Write a protein that binds this ligand. Structure first.
Ligand SMILES: [Fe+3]
Ligand SMILES: [Fe+3]
Ligand SMILES: [Fe+3]
Ligand SMILES: [Fe+3]
Lengths: 348, 346
């Protein structure tokens, strides 16, 4: 069957958090306005996409665009595939603002709510917007990729949305985004350092600068979970385990270009192979968070909390060993065409 | 370095909670009268269709022709065009605006409901508008992308409160009005884009306008339906929006230099005849006729005051914001950071 995007294969579960716990967040408003909002960079001090692109109001514009394209010839298709996937993930931004606005105690109820929570969501969104913009124009000018197939993938992606399975729970929500932000920090950070190798400093600065925005986001979301562990170590420990069993699905897992039915798997494979984001990175993030939130040092947990706590502390090495042995899928990986690069083929 | 803020008290969940069912019921209906107005992905235009092709040997000359044409387009017009583009780029805010509506919100981010499906596909459609105008302005060299990017970040941080109070009634009235506004602005920049000598730019604006009409058509069929099922609540919602006035999605525009950026942008749009105080009236009047407000009967003493107010507001607005004496002729010249502080006539 033709033009059918992939769908979420799990049953939709809404409003799992007990409705009384909504007050905890109303209470933490002030706290958020002092421990969280402080991780937003004020607009006037933020970089903008133009800072890293050829200046179209400068006599230098032509040579700049020309050097950009020359450099891009020395960057192999493999890398463009990954980079394209990252950029597409970024452009599906409106979905992610919705992701935060689904959380019970934290949603923006009007579109301009004076709450600390709604203020964060809006400013976080505003920061994220520059990531897509910048990688978009870069890919556009490069000439190495097929902007029409990329634009088409993006429209499929927004139509599809995503269900991270947070069930409207600020607990699950902020656990989720804590994990994703770090993942984003690793991918972008990796494309950055790798971007230097292939011979493009400017592209490295681009990726690096996006990475730095991610760290700050991670820091912000991790202070919230930390705080939730402090206030409710039982609910939070339980929320943490729940997310992991479910597995953290990536925001663009429903990726579809109208040709490949396994586009996300394929994109990911290349990212894995290239060492941009690996099955191992997923583990390191998990382990980091376990240590960062002091899950192990938690005491006075219900028989429920204890099973959860133990599960979470012993999942990283289990995931490690298992999705370690890249025997039958790393070496014998077939070559595959991607419509994002005009059906040129790269090694999966 | 303070962005403007909504000056009105925040009013949430005004629609009676029982009326949430009306929408759950209309799911199938929506999947046959609304979703039909979305263009399937494979058949949609994409920004690359109207831009220089960067994987073509023709790229250079195409970028070069684009820039040459843009020199013949005056600063006035770039101001308006930039404002339009900025409004488009604040898209995530508008998805949120629809996700705030009580009986229609997407509860997960991927809800199989007709309502959530529409919201997501409408958003996907809108996204190409921003992308296209963005790359156009970027290649043009006529405008200061850094100041524009900064305005955009202020705008999303600010969001907007259209004062729909989570009511699908108010919501879809609102978006019915906006879509038509959008169709007029884009439509006008389109025809005017021809004058100044740029066909391609006209095709860009025109293609955006067409998207808008379809959206308008879709939102209008919902209100029509609401008038049919609940002529009282709908008539009352329609009047409520108008007293409050329909505020534009980008009214909290801020670039870090101008404290009246939206007013100023609008002034230029007005003067240029892209979107005028008169257009606002014509949209209103059209909707009054399109929804058959006047032909409504059996309304409460409440419904009737409302019905009358709405049918007599267009000419009142007309005459009033007609006489552009003290503000059209003696309009001062003002610098915009979007064009490197070059100045245009307000
Ligand atoms: Fe990002
Ligand atoms: Fe981020
Ligand atoms: Fe639009
Ligand atoms: Fe529209």
């Amino acid at each position: 069957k033709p033009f059918m995007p992939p769908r979420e294969v799990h049953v939709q579960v809404t409003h799992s958090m007990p409705p009384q716990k909504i007050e905890i967040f109303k209470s933490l408003d002030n706290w958020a306005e002092e421990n969280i909002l402080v991780h937003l960079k004020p607009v006037e001090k933020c970089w903008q996409p133009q800072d890293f692109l050829p200046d179209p109001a400068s006599d230098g514009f032509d040579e700049q665009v020309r050097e950009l394209r020359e450099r891009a010839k020395e960057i192999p298709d493999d890398y463009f595939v990954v980079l394209v996937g990252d950029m597409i993930t970024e452009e599906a931004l409106p979905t992610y603002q919705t992701m935060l606005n689904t959380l019970d105690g934290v949603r923006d109820e009007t579109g301009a709510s004076p709450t600390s929570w709604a203020i964060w969501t809006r400013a976080w969104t505003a920061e994220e917007n520059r990531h897509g913009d910048l990688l978009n124009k870069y890919l556009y000018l490069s000439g190495r990729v097929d902007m029409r197939q990329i634009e088409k993938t993006i429209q499929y992606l927004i139509g599809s949305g995503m269900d991270p399975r947070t069930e409207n729970s600020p607990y699950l929500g902020f656990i989720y985004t804590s994990f994703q932000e770090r993942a984003d920090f690793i991918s972008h950070g990796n494309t950055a350092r790798q971007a230097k190798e292939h011979g493009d400093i400017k592209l490295a600065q681009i990726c690096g600068t996006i990475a730095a925005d991610e760290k700050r986001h991670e820091t912000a979301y991790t202070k919230i979970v930390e705080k939730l562990f402090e206030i409710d170590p039982d609910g939070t420990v339980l929320a943490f385990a729940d997310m992991m069993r479910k597995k953290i699905s990536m925001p663009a897992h429903l990726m579809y270009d109208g040709r490949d039915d396994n586009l996300f798997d394929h994109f990911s494979a290349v990212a894995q192979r290239l060492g941009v984001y690996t099955a191992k990175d997923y583990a390191d993030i998990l382990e980091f968070l376990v240590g960062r939130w002091k899950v192990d040092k938690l005491t006075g947990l219900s028989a429920e909390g204890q099973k959860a706590q133990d599960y979470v502390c012993r999942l990283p090495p289990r995931i490690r060993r298992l999705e370690e042995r890249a025997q039958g899928r790393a070496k014998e990986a077939p070559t595959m065409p991607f419509s994002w690069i005009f059906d040129r083929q790269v090694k999966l």
